[PDB]
Design a binder for these strands. Structure first.
Ligand SMILES: CN(C)[C@@H]1C(=O)C(C(N)=O)=C(O)[C@@]2(O)C(=O)C3=C(O)c4c(O)c(NC(=O)CN5CCCC5)cc(F)c4C[C@H]3C[C@@H]12
Ligand SMILES: [K+]
Ligand SMILES: [K+]
Ligand SMILES: [K+]
Ligand SMILES: [K+]
Ligand SMILES: [K+]
Ligand SMILES: [K+]
Ligand SMILES: [K+]
Ligand SMILES: [K+]
Ligand SMILES: [K+]
Ligand SMILES: [K+]
Ligand SMILES: [K+]
Ligand SMILES: [K+]
Ligand SMILES: [Mg+2]
Ligand SMILES: [Mg+2]
Ligand SMILES: [Mg+2]
Ligand SMILES: [Mg+2]
Ligand SMILES: [Mg+2]
Ligand SMILES: [Mg+2]
Ligand SMILES: [Mg+2]
Ligand SMILES: [Mg+2]
Ligand SMILES: [Mg+2]
Ligand SMILES: [Mg+2]
Ligand SMILES: [Mg+2]
Ligand SMILES: [Mg+2]
Ligand SMILES: [Mg+2]
Ligand SMILES: [Mg+2]
Ligand SMILES: [Mg+2]
Ligand SMILES: [Mg+2]
Ligand SMILES: [Mg+2]
Ligand SMILES: [Mg+2]
Ligand SMILES: [Mg+2]
Ligand SMILES: [Mg+2]
Ligand SMILES: [Mg+2]
Ligand SMILES: [Mg+2]
Ligand SMILES: [Mg+2]
Ligand SMILES: [Mg+2]
Ligand SMILES: [Mg+2]
Ligand SMILES: [Mg+2]
Ligand SMILES: [Mg+2]
Ligand SMILES: [Mg+2]
Ligand SMILES: [Mg+2]
Ligand SMILES: [Mg+2]
Ligand SMILES: [Mg+2]
Ligand SMILES: [Mg+2]
Lengths: 127, 222, 98, 150, 115, 206, 100, 84
RNA sequence: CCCGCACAAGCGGUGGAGCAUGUGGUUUAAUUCGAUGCAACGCGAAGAACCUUACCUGGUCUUGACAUCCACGGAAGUUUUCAGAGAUGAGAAUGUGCCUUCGGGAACCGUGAGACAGGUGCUGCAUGGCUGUCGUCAGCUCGUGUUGUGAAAUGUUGGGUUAAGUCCCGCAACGAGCGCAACCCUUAUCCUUUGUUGCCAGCGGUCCGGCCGGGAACUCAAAGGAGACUGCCAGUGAUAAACUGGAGGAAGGUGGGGAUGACGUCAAGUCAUCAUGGCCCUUACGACCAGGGCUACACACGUGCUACAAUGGCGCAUACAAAGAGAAGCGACCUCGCGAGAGCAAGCGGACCUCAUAAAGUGCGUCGUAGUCCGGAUUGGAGUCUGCAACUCGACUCCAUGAAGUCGGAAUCGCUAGUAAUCGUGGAUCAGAAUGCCACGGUGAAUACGUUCCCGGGCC
């Protein structure tokens, strides 16, 4: 019936519901084109289905909260990947090879005392 | 004597490497090799077995120090058949002179030994249990012979005074009689009962080791 | 409905205090919704640690305020009696709302 | 570094990792969308002026800007000798793309897309400051051809 | 073209062209054009001489150019004559609005006068 | 270098807090100030009673003070008369009804504060610092400390140049967060000024 | 801090409590849109005549242990130095060294 | 500047000294430390000796001064140049 | 022989401009004191109008502003008047309580002694405590043994190896301690439990709003677990430690980040947080007050912010965060104002309410390379708010003004990845007063051949 995957990226979390269909993609009650202006974001979302060739064989219902454009697109990609592996477990190795199965664990590094940012140190002068 | 030279007690080391102090126990320099004088050997070998009996019939302890890749096996047998102690791998410098400390390594081995049999190992992790497993084996190679030896020895049967210069020097400091198979290429000065002998050939070593096995065993019999 | 909000600086205390509150209520003919773990407030403090200068030498401290919500639904009279005679650990702030 | 120890995602429109790298070199301040728009605008202009494809016309510009050899200040007692070193193929592209972008930024046309299309078309015909820097790098490598083997 | 005794740029949009007048910024410019019923983005060249006359009438409601220059000059003269703190700052060519003079104040002081 | 406070670093790991009340911001500073005044009063009043630790709870509209002491009988007094004096004064300071409990320190030689206070008492009576330090270390190790460190710093023996002297026996693994390191300090107010004492007592891991 | 400086703060807190209601009443009149210009004027003049130390803005938060007028934290009522000392002895409930 | 709804600030002690001075026609300078007081129309013609930190600077009040603070006419810092 | 953003390779800066800010200097009545190569200079100060405040000028007090003790009057208070800049002085109303053995008390006030109080006065080179620093560098030691007449050595060197005195092996050392690592926090995956204030997959609605029944799935919340060990595999290696790949896995070799700072070094910093030996002042070096100063300005240096534009400015439309704060507080909605704001006045001690709108982005339009539709300094006028009070010396708004600046010489700084760069957001301090500090997400690079050189360091 309905295959689910949670995906996360930076501070984004995506809830991806996949059912058999005809290439419908809804994201927060909006089309993929409406939700993401960026073609990179759109590419990121479509990557898993283009890889497995199920672009027009599956309807995706997606909700996504938190982070930004790229975070959300990456969260969605991770969610689709996980939904696809629930749908068909044979796809794992192909999706694994593409790098889509990994939860990208790169987060904003905290600001530290005595630094301007996480690593940016204040300007030194000899005297 | 005919069996001493069958065993190979007769043929000492090359003449290049000789210690001049061992010249009285060198009959020939035949074919670029010093040959140990057996007429000096046999009288001196029996007075060693004499004193080993007198020590072992006082019911003291012999330490069979022979830490070369050839006699490590036989010192770990000529002290088991004998019911005595051995060092068959690296003599830890300070085994006797620093016995107070080296006895704490004995105690740690015995803790680790119980842990291996009981399987407190099994309760600990791979990293932890296998580290204390390897620590057991390292302690056993060094101090396996001298574990049941809560006390400084009363004698120190040595093979090759050259190799066990540390052990002999320790025994000389503490006042323990050494019974060394002193070779032609080796210093006899520190040794108490010099046995002039080839100290390398397994067959030469086994012969000595069966005699010192008996004399101590016969000490214990009476 | 009795809404019980528990606050504490130690989560082990607050979990003990909720365990007792759900015990007393479920004994006494009440339907207990919870304990619901509400967001922990992490209140952070950064102090200079030198008495003088050394601005980059600092300690960062945190008070975590743990928060649990227990709702006692269709509460019995036995329920309300038993809840008031309970004695939770000192260290747990207990706010009751009806 | 003292101990020798990312993968660029291919660009959406054309599927090139080389053009993805080109966008990254053009990009400032993490503004990749802005950089993407410039490059795709420039490549449309470049594809329309040649009749060659966007990536094909890009490759022809890179062909003419890529250095084969460069100098490295390799200090070996007394003075420091500029030693001609073969540029490895990834660095050839890296330098070419960096020089094109550097050249395009120096130009006087209105938008960067136009500045970039002009520099790429100029690169293809061997008449820009990017091509000039490749020629400058080559002649300094030619002038120090004595100090190979170093 | 000629409003308030200055030549306004003919090529520029009216909203920008009128800011050539001393005393007309972006806000007043928008108000003048709103009051004249002229769109902001009409080039001054494209306006009829009827429309330029309406702009002259709207600009005349504000104090601009020499009239504004005399008001500002008189306002500073008043302070300097009073000998109030602000007056003294005007006289000495130092910041008048509390700013530091240990460093900076270069807009008021001009270029660095080396010792 | 400078070292983290051994108690502070272990506060949620192996080491409890000495104040275990909850408060919102409204009451928080007031409670800290009343706790300070209670600890100040009791520390002064029980200076000869070998008080290690004063734990303060605030259950509801009250204060509960546990006094950890090596000499509980002297604190409690004759049929609880002296502890009743403390309770009334604590109740005035806190401005709420007070309960005082007395916990016994069975082993004062293993209590870092009592060891520190013992050394500083001896230094104020002009005992040789090295003698006081060595006995403190000896006594703790005899009574089953897995290790102890004692540091004494200042004008030792009324020297003009201040110096730090320390002695350690056993393990004192200060980077091990699960190490039960009892740490405390004391000041000897001598004729030549302040000698600071620091005591670390390791009582095993976890 | 000096004993006198601590005493000044006590005086300021006491006066601010004493006159709080009067000051609030006068400032209500001064603020009020519907008040007379006479009543607002008189209220302006009256608020001046009250002790300056009755204004709460005259109070400086000081460390309640030392009187330090800098480095204060309101949560604790202490300077940064005394917060740290208390924190490390386990005397500030819940407070521990923070990492994240 | 002070919000118009609150009116101009003057210290009551100065306000009463000015009222007395005007009502008596007293032309002796009014000594004040109220630098923060607004100059009112009734002060016109009075000399007000305004404290500058160390001296009372005589300010002969003119109509142009009305609405300024008294302290504006009594500079507190002495400066005659660096190389003076 | 090794290592580290040390260099190289890169990317962005500083140095030039304006402004903010600290310092030096100079000035001043005072510009309070401290910090001074790295390791002082947006440092103590997490916020100087008054206060703070330590300084100056002047006005004042002398057992005192702040304690304890005694004696002698008085409840405490609350009102209010005059004089005075105020400190304070002189009054005038109005209380007459609380324990009570009915003798007293002791609440809180004078007032008189003098024992003392008081001191941000001096010495950080008399000190404690706390801190910086080499440096999170891999070191530093000890017992016993042994070597040397001895200072000392050995261990700790050596062969491999590691981020690491990390580990293995050898070895007159054998062990041990403090460091390294681990245990702690956080982050990345999953599971269990709980399900409101959070959630909405499937239902039933529906005003289209998780809005309402409901649901407990999912996001998430936060407790408890699981997970990563070079465990597995292959090769290499001394039948070693380890190393190089591979698999699986959310994660791989210390996964990322933090906390954690050995013995010691610099008589390093701090007697002005505090404490403290000694010294010094005591009708003054103490104390109170108003006003001024700490904000001065020929100038020099450090740290920043904003720019110089078109990868941009402006206008319009329109997406997507995280973290946090809040009761003398956060303050919605509505109304009024061009606006800062104001007036009403909900809600919220908070997953509920409020701050609060992310901005960069995207789309459309415009400007067309100009000292400009760049920049936003400076100055005039008019305001708002906080606050007894914004003259010296606040922040903010509106109108007007529209400076320098066209990418910065020698030199020099940061950074190796969710980093740099760039974009907003929040917090502490705080009545008000950030371009600083601390924190939070968004977008998101380049480059690293290498170790010759520069700097700091480790081992022989
Ligand atoms: C930063 N700087 C200026 C120096 C610097 O660069 C370094 C450094 N290590 O780099 C430093 O050491 C310093 O900072 C520092 O701390 C100094 C002192 O303490 C100090 C001191 O206190 C006394 N004291 C007395 O003679 C007291 N008296 C006894 C009789 C009466 C007077 C004498 C004395 F010469 C010194 C040396 C200074 C030097 C100073
Ligand atoms: K204009
Ligand atoms: K200024
Ligand atoms: K010190
Ligand atoms: K030794
Ligand atoms: K002192
Ligand atoms: K001032
Ligand atoms: K700045
Ligand atoms: K700068
Ligand atoms: K402009
Ligand atoms: K001001
Ligand atoms: K620059
Ligand atoms: K504020
Ligand atoms: Mg960031
Ligand atoms: Mg800084
Ligand atoms: Mg909150
Ligand atoms: Mg200013
Ligand atoms: Mg004091
Ligand atoms: Mg204040
Ligand atoms: Mg104005
Ligand atoms: Mg470089
Ligand atoms: Mg500059
Ligand atoms: Mg200064
Ligand atoms: Mg100093
Ligand atoms: Mg000083
Ligand atoms: Mg120095
Ligand atoms: Mg002041
Ligand atoms: Mg008066
Ligand atoms: Mg003093
Ligand atoms: Mg010092
Ligand atoms: Mg060493
Ligand atoms: Mg180690
Ligand atoms: Mg967990
Ligand atoms: Mg792998
Ligand atoms: Mg560690
Ligand atoms: Mg010094
Ligand atoms: Mg003052
Ligand atoms: Mg200053
Ligand atoms: Mg502009
Ligand atoms: Mg705030
Ligand atoms: Mg805000
Ligand atoms: Mg836009
Ligand atoms: Mg690095
Ligand atoms: Mg920023
Ligand atoms: Mg090393």
């Amino acid at each position: 019936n309905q295959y689910y995957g949670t995906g996360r990226r930076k501070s984004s979390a995506a809830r991806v519901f996949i059912k058999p269909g005809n290439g419908k993609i809804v994201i927060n009650q909006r089309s993929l084109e409406q939700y993401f202006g960026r073609e990179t974001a759109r590419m990121v979302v479509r990557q898993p289905l283009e890889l497995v060739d199920m672009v027009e064989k599956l309807d995706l219902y997606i909700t996504v909260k938190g982070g930004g454009i790229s975070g959300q697109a990456g969260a969605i990609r991770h969610g689709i990947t996980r939904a696809l592996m629930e749908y068909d477990e044979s796809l794992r190795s192909e999706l694994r090879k593409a790098g889509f199965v990994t939860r990208d664990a790169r987060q904003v590094e905290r600001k530290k005392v005595g630094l301007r940012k996480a690593r940016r140190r204040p300007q030194f002068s000899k005297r | 004597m005919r069996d001493m030279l069958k065993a190979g007690v007769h043929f000492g080391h090359q003449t290049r490497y000789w210690n001049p102090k061992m010249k009285p126990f060198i009959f020939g320099a035949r074919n670029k090799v010093h040959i140990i004088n057996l007429e000096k050997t046999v009288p001196m070998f029996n007075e060693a077995l004499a004193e080993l009996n007198k020590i072992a019939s006082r019911k003291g302890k012999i330490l069979f120090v022979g830490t070369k890749r050839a006699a490590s096996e036989a010192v770990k047998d000529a002290a088991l058949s004998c019911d005595q102690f051995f060092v068959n791998h690296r003599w830890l410098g300070g085994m006797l002179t620093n016995w107070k400390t080296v006895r704490q390594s004995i105690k740690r081995l015995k803790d680790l030994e119980t842990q291996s049999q009981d399987g407190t190992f099994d309760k600990l992790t791979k990293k932890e249990a296998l580290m204390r497993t390897r620590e057991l084996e390292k302690l056993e190679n060094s101090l396996g012979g001298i574990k049941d030896m809560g006390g400084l020895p009363d004698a120190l049967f040595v093979i090759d005074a050259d190799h066990e210069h540390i052990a002999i020097k320790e025994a000389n400091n503490l006042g323990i009689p050494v019974f060394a198979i002193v070779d032609t290429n080796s210093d006899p000065d520190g040794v108490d009962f010099v046995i002039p002998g080839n100290d390398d050939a397994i067959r030469a070593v086994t012969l000595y080791l069966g005699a010192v096995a008996a004399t101590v065993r016969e000490g214990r019999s009476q | 409905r009795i809404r019980i909000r528990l606050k504490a600086f130690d989560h082990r205390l607050i979990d003990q205090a909720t365990a007792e509150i759900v015990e007393t209520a479920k004994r006494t003919g009440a339907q207990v919704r919870g304990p619901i773990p509400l967001p922990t407030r992490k209140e952070r403090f950064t102090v200079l640690i030198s008495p003088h200068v050394n601005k980059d030498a600092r300690d960062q401290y945190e008070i975590r305020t743990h928060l649990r919500l227990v709702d006692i639904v269709e509460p019995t009279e036995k329920t309300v009696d038993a809840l008031m005679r309970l004695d939770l650990a000192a260290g747990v702030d207990v706010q009751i709302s009806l | 570094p003292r101990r020798r120890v990312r993968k660029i995602l291919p660009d959406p429109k054309f599927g090139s990792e080389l053009l993805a790298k080109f966008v990254n070199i053009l990009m400032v301040d993490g503004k990749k969308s802005t950089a993407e728009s410039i490059v795709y605008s420039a490549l449309e202009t470049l594809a329309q002026r040649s009749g060659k494809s966007e990536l094909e016309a890009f490759e022809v510009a890179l062909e003419n800007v890529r250095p084969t050899v460069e100098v490295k200040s390799r200090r070996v007692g007394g003075s420091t000798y500029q030693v001609p070193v073969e540029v490895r193929p990834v660095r050839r592209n890296a330098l070419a793309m960096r020089w094109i972008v550097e050249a395009a930024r120096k130009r006087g046309d209105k938008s960067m897309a136009l500045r970039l299309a002009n520099e790429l078309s100029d690169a293809a015909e061997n008449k820009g400051t990017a091509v000039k820097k490749r020629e400058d790098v080559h002649r300094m490598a030619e002038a120090n051809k004595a100090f190979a083997h170093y | 073209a000629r409003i308030a005794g200055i030549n306004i740029p003919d090529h520029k949009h009216a909203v920008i062209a009128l800011t050539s007048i001393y005393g007309v910024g972006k806000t007043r410019s928008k108000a003048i054009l709103a009051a004249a019923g002229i769109a902001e983005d009409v080039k001054i060249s494209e306006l009829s001489e009827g429309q330029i006359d309406t702009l002259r009438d709207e600009v005349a409601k504000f104090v601009v150019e020499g009239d504004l220059r005399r008001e500002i000059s008189m306002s500073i003269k008043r302070l300097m004559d009073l000998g109030c703190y602000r007056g003294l700052r005007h006289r000495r060519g130092l910041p008048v609005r509390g700013q530091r003079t240990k460093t900076n104040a270069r807009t008021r002081k001009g270029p660095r006068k080396p010792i | 270098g400078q070292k983290v406070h051994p108690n502070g670093i272990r506060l949620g790991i192996v080491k409890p807090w000495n104040s275990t009340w909850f408060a919102n911001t409204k009451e928080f500073a007031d409670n800290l100030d009343s706790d300070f005044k209670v600890r100040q009063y009791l520390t002064k009043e029980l200076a000869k009673a070998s008080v290690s630790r004063i734990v303060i709870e605030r259950p509801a509209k009250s204060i509960r003070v546990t006094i950890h002491t090596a000499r509980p009988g002297i604190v409690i007094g004759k049929k609880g008369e002296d502890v009743e004096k403390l309770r009334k004064v604590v109740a005035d300071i806190a401005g709420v009804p007070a309960q005082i409990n007395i916990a016994e320190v069975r082993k004062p030689e293993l209590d870092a504060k009592l060891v520190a206070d013992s050394i500083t008492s001896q230094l104020e009576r002009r005992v040789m610092f090295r003698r006081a330090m060595k006995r403190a270390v000896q006594n703790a190790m005899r009574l089953g400390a897995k290790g102890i460190k004692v540091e004494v710093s200042g004008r030792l023996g009324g020297a003009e140049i201040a110096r730090t002297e320390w002695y350690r026996e056993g393990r004192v693994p200060l980077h091990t967060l699960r190490a039960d390191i009892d740490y405390n300090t004391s000041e000897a107010h001598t004729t030549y000024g302040v000698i600071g004492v620091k005591v670390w007592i390791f009582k095993g891991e976890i | 801090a000096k004993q006198s400086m601590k005493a000044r703060e006590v005086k300021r807190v006491a006066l601010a409590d004493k006159y709080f209601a009067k000051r609030a009443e006068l400032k209500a009149i001064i603020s009020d849109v519907n008040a007379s210009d006479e009543d607002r004027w008189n209220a302006v003049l009256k608020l001046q005549t009250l002790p300056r130390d009755s204004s709460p803005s005259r109070q400086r938060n000081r460390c309640r242990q030392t009187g330090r007028p800098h480095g204060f934290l309101r949560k604790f009522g202490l300077s940064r130095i005394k917060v740290r000392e208390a924190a490390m002895r386990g005397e500030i409930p819940g407070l521990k060294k923070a990492s994240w | 500047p002070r919000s118009l709804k609150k009116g101009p600030f003057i210290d009551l002690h100065l306000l009463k000294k000015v009222e007395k001075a005007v009502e008596s026609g007293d032309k002796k300078p009014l000594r004040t430390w109220s630098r923060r007081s607004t100059i009112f129309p009734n002060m016109i013609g009075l000399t007000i000796a305004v404290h500058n930190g160390r001296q009372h600077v005589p300010v002969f009040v003119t109509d142009e001064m009305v609405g300024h603070k008294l302290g504006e006419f009594a500079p507190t810092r002495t400066y005659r140049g660096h190389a003076a």
